[PDB]
Amino acid sequence: GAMTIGRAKVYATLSKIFYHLFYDEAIPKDCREIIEKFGEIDFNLRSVLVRELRGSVLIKDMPQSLAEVYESVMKDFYERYGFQASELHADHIAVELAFMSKLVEREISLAQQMKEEELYKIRAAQHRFIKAHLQPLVKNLPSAPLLNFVRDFVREDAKYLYSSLVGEKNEG
Amino acid sequence: GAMTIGRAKVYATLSKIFYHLFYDEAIPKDCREIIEKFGEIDFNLRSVLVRELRGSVLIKDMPQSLAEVYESVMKDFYERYGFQASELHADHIAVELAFMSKLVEREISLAQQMKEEELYKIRAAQHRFIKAHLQPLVKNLPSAPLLNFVRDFVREDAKYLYSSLVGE
């Protein structure tokens, strides 16, 4: 329904925004309006910052030796769900957001098909991905209006996904 | 047939009973008879108790901070199958039972129409709903005759659905 359609739209729009900002392109009206529906915001970030918004960079706690294989970890997750690499590093926030959008789009299709067991698997994957990769990246974002919106959106989306799963997890 | 008709009836009747109790209303004779066909049961539960029979309240590892998004989870599941929550919270037991009744009614229709692909999907949806939402809710109900009846009915129904689905 509208709620899940909105999840996909926000992930897709945020990803498109970060691709534009990576190249110092203006944010188009359609993208701006989708995000501005939630409150006043600006998109005034420069490529010099946006290029560095990668998990292996932002997560300062990551052991160096594992930072060196993290893109491989990302790619295997992506490949397992048919998601293609772009020209950006696999751990870049634009790419991680695009991956979530693809997962939610898959969920939408499975919902329309009433494929409940497969939908469950894709929702589980969304949770796994948000817990392993995207939330750790976003929790280490520096403060700015757009980035703070992403923090809030991802925090609430993580809560939604976890709440979906917690009951069955604890059934014995 | 009779088995599936019976499943739909029990879910619908339990839902109706919980609505009456929520609203401090007497349980009508038709509802009582349906449930008591399985043995004597007392239907005395105070409205304040019944109002709190929500998945977000009952599921122990769900903190209160997740109750609002959990309502969204419930409504998302409902919408996929053309069901709307009522004026009650979407995670209230009365609503969850009503949703099961609607899924069983759809199963009955699909079986009459020999729509096999869709029938299987709907049965799988019932089982998923029980596993994900209704069984976790009923697990932590207080002990009382009606609550024990529902817990046991749901547990047996889950086993039936799982068995029916594993062959296939």
How far apart CA B69 and CA B75 sit, in angstroms, is 10
Asked if B136 and A164 come within 8 Å (Cβ–Cβ), the reply is: no
Q: Which residue has the tokens 């209230």?
A: B92
Can you tell me whether residue A143 is helix, strand or coil? coil
How far apart CA A90 and CA A86 sit, in angstroms, is 8
Chain A residues in contact with B70 (beta carbon < 8 A): 163-164
Asked if B75 and A1 come within 8 Å (Cβ–Cβ), the reply is: yes
Exposure string over B83-105, b if 16+ CB within 10 A, otherwise e: bebeebbbbbbbbbbbbbbbbbb
Cα dihedral B58, B84, B99, B42 sign: positive
Mutate to test the interface with B, among A112, A164, A170 (most CBs of B within 10 A): A164
**CATH, residue A146:** 1.10.3480.10
Experimental method: X-ray
What DSSP assignment string belongs to B4-65? HHHHHHHHHHHHHHHHHHHTT-PPPHHHHHHHHTTS-------HHHHHT-BHHHHSTT--GG
What is the number of other CB atoms lying within 10 angstroms of the CB of residue B120? 16
Quick one: closest CA in B to A110, which residue?
Answer: B80
Mutate to test the interface with B, among A122, A155, A165, A166 (most CBs of B within 10 A): A166
Cα dihedral B81, A167, B117, B96 sign: negative
> Nearest CA to A146 among A48, A29, A32?
A32
Residue B15 and residue B94 in contact, taking contact as beta carbons nearer than 8 Å: yes
Residue A97 and residue A13 in contact, taking contact as beta carbons nearer than 8 Å: no
Q: Which residues are CB-neighbours of B63 under 8 A, at least 6 positions away?
A: none
Instruction: Give resolution, Å, one decimal.
Output: 1.4
Asked if A116 and B131 come within 8 Å (Cβ–Cβ), the reply is: no
Beta carbon pairs, A and B, within 8 Å: 66
Q: Is A24 left (phi over 0), alpha (psi -120 to 50) or beta?
A: left
Q: Which residue has the tokens 């929550």?
A: B85
Give residue B36's domain range: 1-168
Q: Number of folded domains in chain A?
A: 1
